[PDB]
Tab-separated table of C-alpha atoms and ligand atoms in Angstrom:
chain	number	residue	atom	x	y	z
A	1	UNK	CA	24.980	0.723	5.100
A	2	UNK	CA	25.982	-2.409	3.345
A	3	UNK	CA	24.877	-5.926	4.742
A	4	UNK	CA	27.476	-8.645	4.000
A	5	UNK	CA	25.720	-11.568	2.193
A	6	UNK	CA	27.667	-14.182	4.245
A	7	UNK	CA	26.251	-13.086	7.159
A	8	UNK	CA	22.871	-13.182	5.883
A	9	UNK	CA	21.015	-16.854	6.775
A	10	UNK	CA	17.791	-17.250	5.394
A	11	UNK	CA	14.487	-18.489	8.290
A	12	UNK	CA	11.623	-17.928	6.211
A	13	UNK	CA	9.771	-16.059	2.808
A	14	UNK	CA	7.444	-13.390	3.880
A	15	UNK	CA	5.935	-13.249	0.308
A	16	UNK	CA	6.049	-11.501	-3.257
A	17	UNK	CA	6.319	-7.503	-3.914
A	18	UNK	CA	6.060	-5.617	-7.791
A	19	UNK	CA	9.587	-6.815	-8.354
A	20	UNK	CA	10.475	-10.141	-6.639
A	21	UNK	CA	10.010	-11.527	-3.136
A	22	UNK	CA	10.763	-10.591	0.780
A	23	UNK	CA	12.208	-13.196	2.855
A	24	UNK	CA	13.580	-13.064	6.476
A	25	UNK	CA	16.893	-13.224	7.255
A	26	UNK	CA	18.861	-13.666	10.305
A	27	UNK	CA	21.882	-11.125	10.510
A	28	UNK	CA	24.219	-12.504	12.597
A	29	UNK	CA	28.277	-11.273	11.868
A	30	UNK	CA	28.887	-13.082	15.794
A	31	UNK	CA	27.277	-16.327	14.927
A	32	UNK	CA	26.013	-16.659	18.079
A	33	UNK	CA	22.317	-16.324	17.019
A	34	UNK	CA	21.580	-12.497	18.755
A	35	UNK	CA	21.865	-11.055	15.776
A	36	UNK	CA	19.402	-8.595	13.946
A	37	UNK	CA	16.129	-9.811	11.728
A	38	UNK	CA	15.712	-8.431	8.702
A	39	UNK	CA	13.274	-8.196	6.152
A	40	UNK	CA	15.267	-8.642	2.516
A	41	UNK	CA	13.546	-8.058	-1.219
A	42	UNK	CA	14.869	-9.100	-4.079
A	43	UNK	CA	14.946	-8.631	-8.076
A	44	UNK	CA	13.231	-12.388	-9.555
A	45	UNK	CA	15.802	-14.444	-11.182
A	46	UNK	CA	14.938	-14.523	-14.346
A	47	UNK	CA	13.396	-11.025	-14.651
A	48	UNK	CA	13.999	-8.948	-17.849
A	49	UNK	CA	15.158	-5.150	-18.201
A	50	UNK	CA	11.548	-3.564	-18.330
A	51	UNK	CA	11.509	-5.053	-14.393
A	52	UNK	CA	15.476	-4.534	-13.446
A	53	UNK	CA	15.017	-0.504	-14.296
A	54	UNK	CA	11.873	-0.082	-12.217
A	55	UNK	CA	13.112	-2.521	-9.541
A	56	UNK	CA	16.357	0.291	-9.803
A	57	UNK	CA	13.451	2.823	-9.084
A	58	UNK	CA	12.684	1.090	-5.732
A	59	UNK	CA	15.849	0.866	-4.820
A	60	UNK	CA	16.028	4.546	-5.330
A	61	UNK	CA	12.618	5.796	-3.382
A	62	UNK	CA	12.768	4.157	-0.097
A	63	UNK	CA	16.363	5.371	0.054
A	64	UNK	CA	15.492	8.976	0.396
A	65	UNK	CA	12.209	8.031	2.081
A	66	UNK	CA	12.346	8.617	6.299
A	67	UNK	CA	8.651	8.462	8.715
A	68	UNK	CA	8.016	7.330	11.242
A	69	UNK	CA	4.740	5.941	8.910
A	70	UNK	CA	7.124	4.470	6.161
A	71	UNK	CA	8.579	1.366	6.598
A	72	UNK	CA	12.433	1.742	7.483
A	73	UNK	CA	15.349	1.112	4.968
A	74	UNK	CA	18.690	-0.073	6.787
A	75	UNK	CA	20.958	-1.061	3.324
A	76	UNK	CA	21.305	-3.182	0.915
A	77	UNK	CA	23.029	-6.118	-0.098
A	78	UNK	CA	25.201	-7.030	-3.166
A	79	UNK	CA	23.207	-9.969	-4.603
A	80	UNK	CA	25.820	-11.556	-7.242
A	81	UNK	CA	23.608	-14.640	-7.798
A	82	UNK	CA	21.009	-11.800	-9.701
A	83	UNK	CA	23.986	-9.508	-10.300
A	84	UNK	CA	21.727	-6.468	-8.411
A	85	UNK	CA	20.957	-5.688	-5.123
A	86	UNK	CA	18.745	-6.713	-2.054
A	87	UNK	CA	17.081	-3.721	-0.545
A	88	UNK	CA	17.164	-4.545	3.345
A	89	UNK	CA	14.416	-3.198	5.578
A	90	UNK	CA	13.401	-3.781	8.895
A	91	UNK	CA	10.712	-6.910	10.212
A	92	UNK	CA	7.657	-6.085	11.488
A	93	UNK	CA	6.739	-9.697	12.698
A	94	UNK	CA	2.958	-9.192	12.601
A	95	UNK	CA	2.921	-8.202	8.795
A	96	UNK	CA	0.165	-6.549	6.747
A	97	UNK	CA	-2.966	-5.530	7.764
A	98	UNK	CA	-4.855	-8.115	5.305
A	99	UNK	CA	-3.369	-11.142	7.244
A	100	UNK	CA	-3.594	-9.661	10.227
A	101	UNK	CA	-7.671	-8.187	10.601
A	102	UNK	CA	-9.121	-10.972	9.676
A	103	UNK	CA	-7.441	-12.947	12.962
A	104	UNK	CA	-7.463	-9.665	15.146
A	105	UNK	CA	-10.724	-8.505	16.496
A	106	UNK	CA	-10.182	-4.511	16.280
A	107	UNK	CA	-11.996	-1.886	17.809
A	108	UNK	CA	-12.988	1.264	15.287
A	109	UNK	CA	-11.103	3.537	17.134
A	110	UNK	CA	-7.766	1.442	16.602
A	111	UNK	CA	-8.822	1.413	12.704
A	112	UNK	CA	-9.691	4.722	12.265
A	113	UNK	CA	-5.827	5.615	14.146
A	114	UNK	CA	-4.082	3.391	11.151
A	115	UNK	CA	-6.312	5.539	8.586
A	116	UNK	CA	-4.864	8.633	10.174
A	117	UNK	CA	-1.003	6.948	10.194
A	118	UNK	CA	-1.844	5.862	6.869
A	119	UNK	CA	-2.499	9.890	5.776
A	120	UNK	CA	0.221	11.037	7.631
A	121	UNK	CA	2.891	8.801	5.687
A	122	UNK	CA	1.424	9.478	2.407
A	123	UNK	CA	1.177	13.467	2.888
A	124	UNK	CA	4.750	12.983	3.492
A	125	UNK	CA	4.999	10.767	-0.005
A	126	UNK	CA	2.847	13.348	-2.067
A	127	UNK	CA	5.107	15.981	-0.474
A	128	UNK	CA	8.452	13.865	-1.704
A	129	UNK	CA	6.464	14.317	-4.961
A	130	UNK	CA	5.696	10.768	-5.120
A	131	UNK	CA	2.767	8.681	-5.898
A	132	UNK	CA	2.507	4.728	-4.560
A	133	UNK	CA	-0.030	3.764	-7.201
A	134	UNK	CA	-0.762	0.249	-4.961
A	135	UNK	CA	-1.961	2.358	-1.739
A	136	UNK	CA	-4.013	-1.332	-0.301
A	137	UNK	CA	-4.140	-3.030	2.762
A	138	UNK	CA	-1.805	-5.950	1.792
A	139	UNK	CA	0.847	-2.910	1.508
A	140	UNK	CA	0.195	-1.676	5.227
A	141	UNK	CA	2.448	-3.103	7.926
A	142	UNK	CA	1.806	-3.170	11.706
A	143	UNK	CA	4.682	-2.543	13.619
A	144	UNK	CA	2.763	-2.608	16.854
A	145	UNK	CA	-1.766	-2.851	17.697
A	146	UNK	CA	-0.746	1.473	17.483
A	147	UNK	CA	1.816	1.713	14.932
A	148	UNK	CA	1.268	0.646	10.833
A	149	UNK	CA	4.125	1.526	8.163
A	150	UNK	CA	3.529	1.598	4.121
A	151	UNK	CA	5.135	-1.286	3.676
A	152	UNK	CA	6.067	-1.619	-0.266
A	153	UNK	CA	7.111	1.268	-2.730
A	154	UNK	CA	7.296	-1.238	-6.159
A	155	UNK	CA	4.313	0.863	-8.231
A	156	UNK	CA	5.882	4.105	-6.689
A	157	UNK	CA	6.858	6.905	-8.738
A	158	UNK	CA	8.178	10.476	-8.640
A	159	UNK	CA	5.894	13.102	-9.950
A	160	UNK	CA	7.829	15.676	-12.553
A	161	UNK	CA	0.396	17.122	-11.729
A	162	UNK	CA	0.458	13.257	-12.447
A	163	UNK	CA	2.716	10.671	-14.403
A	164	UNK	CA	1.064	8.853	-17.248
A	165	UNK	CA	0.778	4.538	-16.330
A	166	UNK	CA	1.647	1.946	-19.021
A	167	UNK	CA	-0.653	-6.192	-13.149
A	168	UNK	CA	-2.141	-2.792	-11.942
A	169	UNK	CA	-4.473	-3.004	-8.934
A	170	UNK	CA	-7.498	-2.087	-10.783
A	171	UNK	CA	-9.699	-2.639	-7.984
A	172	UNK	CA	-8.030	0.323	-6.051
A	173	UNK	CA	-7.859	2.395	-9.005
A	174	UNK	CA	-9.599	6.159	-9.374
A	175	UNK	CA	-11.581	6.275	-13.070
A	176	UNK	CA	-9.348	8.718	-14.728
A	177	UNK	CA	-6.399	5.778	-14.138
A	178	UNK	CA	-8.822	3.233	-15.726
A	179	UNK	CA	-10.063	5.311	-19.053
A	180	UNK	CA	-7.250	7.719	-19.428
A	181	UNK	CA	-4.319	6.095	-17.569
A	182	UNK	CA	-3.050	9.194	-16.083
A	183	UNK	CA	-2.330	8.937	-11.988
A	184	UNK	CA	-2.749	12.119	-10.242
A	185	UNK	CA	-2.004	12.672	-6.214
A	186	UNK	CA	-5.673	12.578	-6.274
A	187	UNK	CA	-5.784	9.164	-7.731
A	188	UNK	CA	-3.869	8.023	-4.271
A	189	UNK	CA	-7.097	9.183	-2.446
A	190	UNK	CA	-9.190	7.274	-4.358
A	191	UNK	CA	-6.838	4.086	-3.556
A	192	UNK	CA	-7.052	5.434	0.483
A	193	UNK	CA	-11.187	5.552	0.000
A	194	UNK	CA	-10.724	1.839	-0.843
A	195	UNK	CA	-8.218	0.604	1.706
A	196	UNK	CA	-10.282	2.017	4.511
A	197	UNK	CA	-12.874	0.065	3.145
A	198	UNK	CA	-10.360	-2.685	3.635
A	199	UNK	CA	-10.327	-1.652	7.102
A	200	UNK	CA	-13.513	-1.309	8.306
A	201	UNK	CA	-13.908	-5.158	6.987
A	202	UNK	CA	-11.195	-6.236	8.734
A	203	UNK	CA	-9.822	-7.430	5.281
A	204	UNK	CA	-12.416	-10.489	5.052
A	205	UNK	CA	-12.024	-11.613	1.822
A	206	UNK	CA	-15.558	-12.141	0.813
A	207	UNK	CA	-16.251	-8.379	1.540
A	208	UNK	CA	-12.951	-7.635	-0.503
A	209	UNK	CA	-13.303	-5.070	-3.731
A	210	UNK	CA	-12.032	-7.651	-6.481
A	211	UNK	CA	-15.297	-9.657	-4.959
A	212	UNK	CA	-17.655	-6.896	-4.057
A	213	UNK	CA	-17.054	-5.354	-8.128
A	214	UNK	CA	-16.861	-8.665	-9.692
A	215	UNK	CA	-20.448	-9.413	-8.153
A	216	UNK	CA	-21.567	-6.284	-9.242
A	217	UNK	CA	-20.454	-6.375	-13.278
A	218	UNK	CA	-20.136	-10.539	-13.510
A	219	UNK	CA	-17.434	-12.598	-15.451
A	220	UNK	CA	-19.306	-13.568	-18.627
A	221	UNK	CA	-17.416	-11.265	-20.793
A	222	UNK	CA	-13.879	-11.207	-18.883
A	223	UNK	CA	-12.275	-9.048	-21.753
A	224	UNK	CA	-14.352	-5.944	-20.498
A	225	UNK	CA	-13.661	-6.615	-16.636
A	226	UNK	CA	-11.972	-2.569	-17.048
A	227	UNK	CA	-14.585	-1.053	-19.395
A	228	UNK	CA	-17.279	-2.064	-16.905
A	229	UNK	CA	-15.730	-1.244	-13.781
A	230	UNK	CA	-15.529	2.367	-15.216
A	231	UNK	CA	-18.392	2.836	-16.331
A	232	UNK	CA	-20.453	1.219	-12.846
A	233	UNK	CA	-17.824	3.813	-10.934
A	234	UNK	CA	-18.727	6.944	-13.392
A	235	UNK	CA	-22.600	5.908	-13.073
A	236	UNK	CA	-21.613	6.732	-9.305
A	237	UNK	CA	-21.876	3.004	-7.549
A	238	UNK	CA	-19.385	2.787	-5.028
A	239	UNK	CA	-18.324	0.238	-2.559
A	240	UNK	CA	-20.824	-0.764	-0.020
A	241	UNK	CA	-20.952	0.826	3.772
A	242	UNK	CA	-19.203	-1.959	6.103
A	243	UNK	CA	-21.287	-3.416	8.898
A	244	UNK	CA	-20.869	-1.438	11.938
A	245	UNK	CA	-19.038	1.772	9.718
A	246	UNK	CA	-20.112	5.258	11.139
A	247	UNK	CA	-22.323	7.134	8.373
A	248	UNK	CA	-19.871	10.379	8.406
A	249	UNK	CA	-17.084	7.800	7.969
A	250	UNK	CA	-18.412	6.513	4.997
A	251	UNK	CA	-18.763	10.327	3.960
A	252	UNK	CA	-15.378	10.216	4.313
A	253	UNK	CA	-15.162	6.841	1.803
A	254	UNK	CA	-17.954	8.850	-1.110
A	255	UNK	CA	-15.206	11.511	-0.729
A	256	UNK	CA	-12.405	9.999	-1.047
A	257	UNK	CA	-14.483	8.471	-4.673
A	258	UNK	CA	-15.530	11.715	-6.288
A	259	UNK	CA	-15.127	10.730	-9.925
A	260	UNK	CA	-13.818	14.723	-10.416
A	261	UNK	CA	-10.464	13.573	-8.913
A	262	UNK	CA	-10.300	18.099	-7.395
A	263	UNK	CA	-13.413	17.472	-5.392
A	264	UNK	CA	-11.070	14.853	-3.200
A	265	UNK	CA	-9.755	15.932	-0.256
A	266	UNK	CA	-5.792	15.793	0.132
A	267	UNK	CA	-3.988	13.495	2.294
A	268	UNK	CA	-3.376	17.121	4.083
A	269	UNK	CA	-7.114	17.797	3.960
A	270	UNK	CA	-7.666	14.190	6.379
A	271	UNK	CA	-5.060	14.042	8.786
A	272	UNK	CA	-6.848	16.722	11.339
A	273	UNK	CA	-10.490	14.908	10.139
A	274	UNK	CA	-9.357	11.122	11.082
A	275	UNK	CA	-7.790	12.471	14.341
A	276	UNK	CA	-10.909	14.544	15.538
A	277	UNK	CA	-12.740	11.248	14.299
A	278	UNK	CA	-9.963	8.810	16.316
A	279	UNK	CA	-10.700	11.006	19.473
A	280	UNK	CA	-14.660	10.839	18.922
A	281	UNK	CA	-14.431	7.067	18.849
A	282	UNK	CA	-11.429	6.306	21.249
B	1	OVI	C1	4.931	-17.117	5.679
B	1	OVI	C2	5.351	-16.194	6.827
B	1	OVI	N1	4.532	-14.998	6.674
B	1	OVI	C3	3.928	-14.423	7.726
B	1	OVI	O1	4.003	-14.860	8.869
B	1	OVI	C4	3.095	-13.169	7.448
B	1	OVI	C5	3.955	-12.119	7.230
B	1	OVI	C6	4.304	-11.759	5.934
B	1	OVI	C7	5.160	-10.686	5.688
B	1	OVI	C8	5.668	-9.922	6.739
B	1	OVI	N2	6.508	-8.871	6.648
B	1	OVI	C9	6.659	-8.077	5.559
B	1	OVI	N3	5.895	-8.117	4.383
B	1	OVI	C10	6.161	-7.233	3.339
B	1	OVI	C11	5.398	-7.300	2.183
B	1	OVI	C12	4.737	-6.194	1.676
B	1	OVI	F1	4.790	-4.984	2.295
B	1	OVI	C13	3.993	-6.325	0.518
B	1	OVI	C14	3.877	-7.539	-0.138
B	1	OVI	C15	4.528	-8.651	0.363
B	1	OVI	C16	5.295	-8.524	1.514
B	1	OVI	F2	5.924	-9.582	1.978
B	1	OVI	N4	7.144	-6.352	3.452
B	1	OVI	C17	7.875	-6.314	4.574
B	1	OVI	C18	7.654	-7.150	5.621
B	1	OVI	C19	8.588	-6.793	6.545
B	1	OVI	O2	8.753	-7.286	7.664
B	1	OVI	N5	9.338	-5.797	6.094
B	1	OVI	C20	8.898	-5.504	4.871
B	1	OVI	C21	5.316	-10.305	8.032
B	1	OVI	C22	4.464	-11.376	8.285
């Protein structure tokens, strides 16, 4: 489907993806003011080819991606001004789950249920044969208080084992990303592990991993932020257990952070675990 720019008027910016920013639009061809509201991303301005080729790749992923746990592509838009174009989604008013936990008081049966719809969506990724590489809570998008949708594909990538990385979310990232910079289906667990950790702190920022790891290793010697963050996760420290997290669930965590990335479960492996979970809770 192709969106006609001229019936595209701007209401607000939503914020910045990998490659550019999402705004919402009003789509309104009648001009009465009933028309559709969209969620629009866009290629930066200025940006050079190393960005235009991978925003390209976007453009190329969510096309072929459909779940009912992915967020949903409608078209795109020829954007002249950036001579590209606009990859049109739908709007899920309430937005990611890191601006919306920390104003929502959730119970842990509703978390563990977008864990499960979170697992779901990316078993259907991994079986597309792609990774995300930026699997996090900002990326998670609640639809309705029963219904999240991976929300931004930017990092995505389609897998030819694992593809080898060049920014990067660091803080989400599995040890054999950091010190060999190789990102395996495995490595997406690892990045799960973390944003149910997200979760289960209902995304307050002072529990958040940048600050949890940066109190652990410092910032005296900023250069070797990544050298020490590797070698505190290969030591085996991990992530505190959230206030008020089930033990077994934070089983579930210390699995999802094996260091051997093939002693993770698969995305497979925890969709019938988080849903005998859900119903344990619920
Ligand atoms: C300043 C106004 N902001 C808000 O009231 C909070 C808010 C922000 C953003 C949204 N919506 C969205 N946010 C992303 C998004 C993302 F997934 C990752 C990074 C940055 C993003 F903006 N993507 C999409 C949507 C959307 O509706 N459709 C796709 C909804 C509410």
């Amino acid at each position: 489907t192709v969106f006609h720019k001229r019936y595209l008027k701007k209401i607000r910016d939503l914020g910045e993806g990998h490659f550019g920013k999402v705004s919402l639009y009003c789509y309104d061809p009648t001009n009465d003011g009933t028309g559709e509201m969209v969620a629009v991303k866009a290629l930066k301005a200025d940006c050079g080819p190393q960005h235009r080729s991978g925003w390209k790749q976007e453009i190329d992923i969510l096309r072929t991606l459909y779940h009912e746990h992915i967020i949903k592509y409608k078209g795109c838009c020829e954007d002249q001004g950036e001579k590209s174009l606009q990859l049109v989604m739908e709007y899920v008013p309430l937005g990611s789950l890191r601006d919306y936990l920390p104003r929502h008081s959730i119970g842990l049966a509703q978390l563990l249920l977008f864990a499960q719809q979170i697992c779901e969506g990316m078993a259907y990724l991994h079986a597309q044969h792609y990774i995300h590489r930026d699997l996090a809570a900002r990326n998670v998008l609640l639809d309705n208080d029963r219904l999240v949708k991976i929300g931004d594909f930017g990092l995505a990538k389609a897998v030819p084992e694992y593809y080898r990385v060049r920014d990067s979310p660091v803080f989400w990232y599995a040890p054999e990303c950091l010190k060999e910079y190789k990102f395996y289906y495995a490595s997406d667990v690892w990045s799960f592990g973390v944003t149910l950790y997200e979760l289960l702190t209902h995304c307050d920022s002072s529990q958040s991993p940048p600050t949890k790891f940066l109190e652990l290793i410092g910032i005296a010697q900023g250069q070797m932020t990544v050298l020490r963050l590797t070698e505190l996760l290969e030591r085996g420290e991990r992530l505190p257990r959230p206030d008020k997290c089930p033990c077994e669930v934070y089983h579930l965590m210390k699995n999802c952070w094996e260091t051997e990335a093939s002693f993770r479960p698969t995305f497979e492996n925890l969709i019938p675990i988080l849903k005998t979970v859900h119903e344990k809770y619920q």
